[PDB]
């Protein structure tokens, strides 16, 4: 097996930057080298084949060079849509092998989240459970605090968070926080709030609702 090594393994750059990734093969592979892009939550896509040849519909800003054991992949000017894991692959000897991948991240300016709160649906309440959802949309950087408040008191209970990968259009993140209660516990309280802390916010933002109205 030919061992394919990529360098760097991950990198962060800004929109407009020139990006260069290197691939090393454990032995000479001539020009039998391919590059693939894997955007977050998507399947890999072919970008370059035979070291420097572009596949159909691949943006002109992507290019490849090298021979033998050393290869280079270049993005001439980084675009928000280039957030992805890049993989080189040798097609010289069986088994065909891939490099470990290079995760490309985008550095951008601070963006405050837009905060939305969702009470449990009447349909879920009928099943005996109440999930309260707090959504933090399109913020940057990733660092954010979400605090549940129930009848103004801090709620230390069954809450879980989930965060998306960087958006292919604006390089932001989105986050959800879900508080889960029994229908009986949910009906014991009136005000449900989520307090959000982010560096884009001058002071912590609270979004709330009164149960029922």
């Amino acid at each position: 097996d030919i061992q394919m090594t990529q360098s760097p393994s991950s990198l962060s750059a800004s929109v407009g930057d020139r990006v260069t990734i290197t691939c090393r093969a454990s032995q000479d592979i001539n020009n039998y080298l391919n590059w693939y892009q894997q955007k977050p939550g998507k399947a890999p896509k072919l970008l370059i084949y035979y070291t420097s040849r572009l596949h159909s519909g691949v943006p002109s800003r992507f290019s490849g060079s090298g021979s033998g054991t050393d290869f280079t992949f270049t993005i001439s000017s980084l675009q928000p849509e280039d957030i992805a894991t890049y993989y080189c692959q040798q097609g010289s000897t069986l088994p065909f092998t891939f490099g470990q991948g290079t995760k490309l991240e985008i550095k951008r300016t601070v963006a405050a989240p837009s905060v939305f709160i969702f009470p449990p649906s009447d349909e879920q309440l009928k099943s005996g459970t109440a999930s309260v959802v707090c959504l933090l949309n399109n913020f940057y950087p990733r660092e954010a605090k979400v605090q549940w408040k129930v009848d103004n008191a801090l709620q230390s209970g069954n809450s879980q968070e989930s965060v998306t990968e960087q958006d292919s259009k604006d390089s932001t993140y989105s986050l959800s926080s879900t508080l889960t209660l029994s229908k009986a516990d949910y009906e014991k309280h009136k005000v449900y709030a989520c307090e959000v802390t982010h560096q884009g916010l001058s002071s912590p933002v609270t979004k709330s609702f009164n149960r029922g109205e």
């Binding site: 084949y49 010289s92 939305f116 649906s121 999930s131 989930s162 609702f209």
Partner: protein
């Protein structure tokens, strides 16, 4: 255009077997070599093997020759992956691919098209379909001219669930969150969309939820 659609993914007990299929469209399948590649969650790409047009050459990565058998049906334009005696290390997204740009008298190619993949989970747990609940847009989910709405896909196993909005006609402002493992060992996720606030009473928003491991298909209408 070239389309590759894998199916058969889901839960397999350790030591269990499974057959994956890859149905194709948009090309003369019988003229191409076909291949399988896998990717374990948060890991890299691993080539499993390949098969030529008339199945006289079937090559595998040596360390996986025992776990996999590749075959094809040219009349049905279908590629198959027989998975045998699966281990926990075999949990991965399995992609069918189309080799192209063939070398002249040299065994070379690049995989020009890839399917969306099928997740195979190796575990002793049982399959569970999810409940789908609306996340209704309100003034509490409205920032000026922008409103947020969504769907809460609760209590399923194994992963994954796919969500699309209005049968794929709504993609802008969509965020489908990575699934979270709950205290019960069941997964849960939400899919959200930001939309014009003025379109709320007008436009219909339906989240299309698909949990292929349990063959669960749910179209939930989300109303203000």
């Amino acid at each position: 255009e070239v389309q590759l659609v894998e199916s058969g993914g889901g839960l397999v007990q350790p030591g269990g077997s499974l057959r994956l299929s890859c149905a194709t469209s948009g090309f003369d399948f019988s003229r191409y070599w076909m291949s399988w590649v896998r990717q374990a969650p948060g890991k890299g790409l691993v080539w499993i093997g390949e098969v030529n047009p008339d199945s006289t050459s079937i090559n595998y990565t040596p360390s996986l020759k025992d776990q996999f058998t590749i075959s094809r049906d040219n009349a049905k334009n279908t590629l198959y992956l027989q998975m045998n005696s699966l281990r926990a290390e075999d949990t991965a997204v399995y992609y069918c691919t189309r080799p192209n740009y063939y070398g002249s008298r040299y065994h070379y190619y690049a995989m020009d098209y890839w399917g969306q993949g099928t997740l195979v989970t190796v575990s002793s747990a049982s399959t569970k379909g999810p409940s789908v609940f609306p996340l209704a847009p309100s003034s509490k989910s409205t920032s000026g001219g922008t409103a947020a709405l969504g769907c809460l896909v609760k209590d399923y196993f194994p992963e994954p669930v796919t969500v699309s909005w209005n049968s794929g006609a709504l993609t802008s402002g969509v965020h489908t969150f990575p699934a979270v493992l709950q205290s019960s060992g069941l997964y849960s996720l939400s899919s959200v969309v930001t939309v014009p606030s003025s379109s709320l009473g007008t436009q219909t928003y339906i989240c299309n939820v698909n949990h292929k491991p349990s063959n669960t298909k749910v179209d939930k209408r989300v109303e203000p």
